[PDB]
């Protein structure tokens, strides 16, 4: 096994595994956007082009992957952001366990896509049907969308410094739940805890929000109510991007003049270790502490020590499944695979064929599509047949049981 890196620059489409030193340059790709790519249904990859008003579709399932464009998908408008709502809870057959294999044709439910001027397009993917369009949600832009639980809630962030939490059933059948104005300048990114539950009443789900205000805001999400922040940090540099550890043990922030780290289980000078993020369910106080960051060159002054990792002008970050490596995308269009503790680059991936790293993704792995409808909306009709394309997938198909059958069989004969 090994991990798989899918990153794309403004003119380049490289795909490469971390421990292989082999890579595939996708031929046609163009982006000027921060988060515009997504991997769909373990068979496809969607990339939203810039200045063409269409999505390119690459097939990534093969042993020898398709370098070329498998398919195109025109759109009404050039749109920047993307997100997918993965369908889950259908393959187990909960009524009786049969453990269905995946079909060769699988797809998610939704394709969230957002454009400039704040407009949100959402599309059923099994059949291209534009269920709903919100004309205006943010009033300047959207920069990132993410579904935090399986299909339950989605979170959006734009350049109006407002981070919005929807509810998918109140968005597809809109009036969102809660809005977050704590920043003063454009929110460039956010991240949410990889460890999650099935609900929000009994979890404390952490939402880290990052802007050009040089602040990092950690919100506790447990509703049943509004979310309460419990810490906010401050930075001298204009912070750009962020990722977490896979257990909410640390934070790694990407910015101009380097990538910095920060331990959330902060170790003091008595062998005393303080959790900055402690919380409960709905009963929780609103007294969000303030701290400030300062590099390496004990915390009751209102200061914390971040440890400098790198000096590169990073655009994007991602993390490995171990939680020990960072993959950082610089502005010279190349990725550095670095180790967190020693602060020593182990690998440098470039593209072969230039701009910066627009987006990148990682997931571990072992060794036709409908057209989208441009301005059409499925109304309140009941005589309409909401047809979709779907496939179920076969189920998985000793000797002592056979002999017991034989023993029961033998009694019937008198011979």
């Amino acid at each position: 096994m090994d991990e798989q890196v899918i990153f794309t620059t403004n003119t380049s489409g490289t795909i490469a595994s971390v421990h292989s030193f082999e890579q595939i340059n996708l031929r046609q790709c163009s982006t000027q956007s921060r988060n515009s790519c997504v991997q769909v249904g373990n068979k496809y990859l969607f990339i939203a082009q810039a200045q063409k008003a269409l999505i390119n579709v690459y097939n990534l399932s093969g042993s020898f992957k398709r370098e070329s464009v498998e398919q195109r998908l025109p759109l009404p408008e050039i749109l920047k952001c993307l997100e997918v709502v993965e369908n889950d809870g259908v393959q187990y057959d909960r009524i009786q366990g049969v453990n269905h294999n995946l079909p060769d044709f699988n797809l998610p439910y939704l394709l969230l896509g957002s454009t400039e001027s704040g407009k949100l397009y959402i599309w059923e993917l099994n059949s291209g049907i534009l269920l709903n369009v919100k004309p205006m949600a943010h009033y300047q832009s959207i920069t990132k969308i993410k579904s935090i639980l399986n299909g339950k809630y989605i979170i959006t962030s734009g350049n109006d410094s407002r981070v919005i939490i929807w509810q998918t059933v109140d968005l597809v059948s809109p009036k969102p739940l809660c809005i977050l104005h704590d920043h003063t300048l454009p929110v460039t990114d956010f991240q949410v805890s990889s460890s999650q539950g099935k609900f929000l009443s009994c979890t404390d789900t952490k939402l880290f929000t990052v802007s050009q205000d040089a602040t990092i805001r950690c919100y506790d999400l447990s509703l049943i109510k509004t979310p309460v922040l419990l810490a906010t940090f401050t930075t001298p540099y204009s912070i750009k991007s962020i990722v977490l550890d896979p257990a909410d043990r640390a934070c790694y922030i990407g910015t101009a003049e380097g990538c910095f780290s920060l331990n959330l289980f902060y170790k003091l000078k008595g062998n005393a270790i303080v959790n900055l993020l402690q919380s409960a369910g709905v009963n929780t106080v609103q007294k969000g502490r303030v701290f400030s960051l300062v590099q390496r060159n004990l915390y009751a002054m209102g200061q914390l020590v971040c440890e400098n990792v790198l000096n590169s002008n990073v655009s994007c970050l991602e993390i490995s499944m171990d939680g020990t490596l960072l993959l950082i995308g610089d502005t010279e269009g190349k990725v550095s695979i670095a180790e967190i503790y020693s602060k020593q680059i182990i690998r440098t991936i470039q593209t072969l064929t230039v701009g910066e790293v627009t987006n990148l993704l990682t997931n571990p792995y072992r060794l036709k599509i409908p057209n989208l409808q441009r301005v059409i909306f499925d109304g309140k009709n009941k005589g309409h047949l909401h047809d979709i394309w779907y496939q179920i997938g076969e189920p998985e198909a000793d000797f002592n049981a056979y002999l017991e059958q034989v023993k029961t069989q033998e009694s019937i004969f008198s011979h």
């Binding site: 809870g89 009524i95 299909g151 402690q278 909401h386 023993k407 069989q409 019937i412 011979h415």
Partner: protein, 547 residues
């Protein structure tokens, strides 16, 4: 060498009883008789001896021979790849000799298990040879052209045994089945037009599944599906001769808006229509029996795997299920053309909820498979479940619990459906009146997968919303009392009550008097690991809290 001298086993197969024959079978399973050079001297002796058992016998040598043939084909690739065709041809020859005379072997009082053993052995030898490509081409398939119609005619009398074998053959060897499909179809239609209640659920399931799999030869699946879906609107309109649908004129318009297609199908419309005289009050059960007959075929057309996608019409199915739940006496009154008779009204009151229960069954299978692909009306199907709940003759939400006891089987599916729905939605919904009724239903019915489903329902309710005090303390008393009952009567408490107690404890409902001392003392000694982490984390945490 520690070999068991296989020629001695073959010397003892011809004359053997159970206490030695089973050890003979267990020895042939050894993975040591798979050497190449043994294939000429002693394995041939074994094979020809088994063939002597098959080709002649007293109907006990046949049983012995087919069983040991299966065992020595599964655990020897050499024997299979050499003599599987011969063994298969032998047992099929005996099966063809037997299927000619079904009546005379059934009056021997061993023929049924004989056909069972024959068909199972043939099926095993088939499914061993199907995914080996060289052993299939011109070594399995030219026998299939003889094997299909022999199994077709035997499905008429013994359908439970055969139909899975034919299902697998159709799914894998589809093109070889093309000449026989009509010959198969006119067998299935006779079992369906026949009583269809002498068959259990398993055989009905197989019948519907095979009838679906006939339609494999992108589009014919859709034609058969829409044809079955079109045969509901007549039956629902015939239910209008009992109770008026003209009152609301919203269910009426939805009944008009259901699909029907005519003069484009006579190959899947094969079913008689219903007379339904209201002078025989025991003849109205034809309606829900017909509706179950249609729904089984419908979910067979939906919920089966295929090597292609399906253009499945979910909107029509949701419209149909909304229509089926509209059938009730609580908002729609009885027709005045029919005259009141106590026995007739009694069978009417008991037969309407089954008609609703079929729509619930179809929604269950529509949400089990296709989860989060019909999400745009999951709130509506939660709203229409309230129509299932029975009320008294005063519409002020007085529930009649005497009838609810007759619907425990039907309400289990309702709670399972609700648990499957709420595991896809958020926490801001407008269904609290339905939850408050469902809780009252469950708390009546409780006082055994029933406990698991209702406890998961309570967990969903307590993790989604802050409920009022009275249902909450009712749930708390229920969980506490039942867990105490099982632990005073037995030694343990199951996992469902444990997770229910944990959800109760962590809930913001904290001011009760029995939550704090009793719900925790039961968990302190239960041996659950999830509760250990609450009492002893595995990660640093502050000694002082600001709450």
């Amino acid at each position: 060498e520690e070999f068991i001298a296989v020629s001695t086993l073959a010397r003892n197969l011809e004359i053997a009883k159970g206490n030695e024959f089973h050890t003979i079978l267990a020895t042939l399973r050894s993975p040591v008789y798979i050497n190449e050079q043994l294939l000429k001297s002693e394995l041939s002796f074994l094979v020809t001896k088994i063939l002597k058992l098959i080709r002649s016998g007293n109907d006990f040598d046949l049983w012995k021979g087919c069983h040991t043939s299966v065992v020595t084909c599964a655990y020897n690739p050499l024997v299979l790849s050499t003599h599987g065709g011969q063994l298969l041809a032998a047992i099929y020859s005996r099966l063809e000799q037997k299927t000619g005379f079904y009546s005379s072997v059934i009056s021997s009082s061993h023929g049924k298990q004989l056909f069972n053993t024959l068909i199972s052995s043939v099926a095993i030898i088939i499914d061993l040879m199907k995914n080996k490509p060289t052993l299939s081409r011109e070594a399995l398939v030219p026998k299939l052209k003889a094997i299909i119609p022999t199994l077709i005619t035997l499905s008429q009398y013994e359908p439970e045994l055969v139909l899975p074998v034919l299902q697998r053959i159709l799914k894998r060897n589809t093109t070889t089945f093309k000449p026989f499909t009509n010959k198969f179809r006119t067998v299935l239609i006779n079992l369906i037009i026949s009583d269809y209640a002498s068959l259990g659920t398993k055989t009905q399931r197989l019948v519907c599944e095979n009838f679906a799999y006939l339609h494999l030869l992108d589009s014919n699946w859709r034609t058969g599906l829409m044809s079955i879906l079109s045969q509901f609107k007549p039956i629902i309109q015939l239910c209008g001769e009992i109770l008026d649908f003209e009152q609301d004129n919203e269910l009426y318009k939805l009944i008009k808006s259901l699909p029907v297609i005519d003069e484009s199908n006579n190959k899947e419309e094969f079913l008689p229509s219903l007379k339904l005289d209201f002078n025989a009050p025991l003849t109205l059960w034809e309606i829900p029996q017909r509706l179950s007959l249609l729904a089984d075929m419908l979910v067979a057309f939906i919920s089966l795997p295929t090597p292609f996608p399906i253009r499945v019409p979910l909107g029509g199915i949701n419209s149909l299920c909304e229509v089926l739940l509209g059938v009730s006496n609580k908002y729609l009154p009885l027709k005045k053309e029919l005259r009141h008779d106590n026995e007739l009204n009694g069978v009417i009151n008991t037969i309407l909820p089954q008609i609703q229960f079929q729509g619930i069954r179809l929604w269950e299978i529509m949400v089990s498979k296709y989860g989060k692909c019909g999400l745009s009306f999951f709130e509506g199907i939660l709203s229409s479940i309230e129509l299932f709940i029975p009320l008294k003759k005063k519409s002020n939400n007085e529930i009649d619990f005497n009838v609810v006891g007759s619907l425990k089987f039907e309400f289990a599916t309702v709670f399972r459906l609700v648990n499957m729905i709420l595991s896809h939605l958020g926490h801001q919904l407008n269904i609290i009146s339905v939850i408050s009724q469902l809780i009252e239903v469950a708390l009546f019915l409780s006082h055994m997968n029933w406990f698991n489903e209702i406890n998961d329902f309570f967990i969903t309710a307590l993790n989604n919303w802050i409920l009022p005090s009275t249902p909450h303390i009712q749930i708390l008393k229920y969980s506490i009392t039942q867990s105490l009952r099982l632990k005073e009567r037995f030694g343990y408490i199951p996992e469902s009550f444990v997770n229910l107690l944990r959800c109760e404890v962590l809930h913001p409902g904290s001011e009760r008097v029995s939550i704090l001392p009793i719900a925790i003392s039961l968990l302190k000694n239960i041996n659950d690991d999830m509760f250990e982490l609450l009492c002893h984390p595995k990660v640093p945490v502050g000694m002082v809290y600001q709450l």
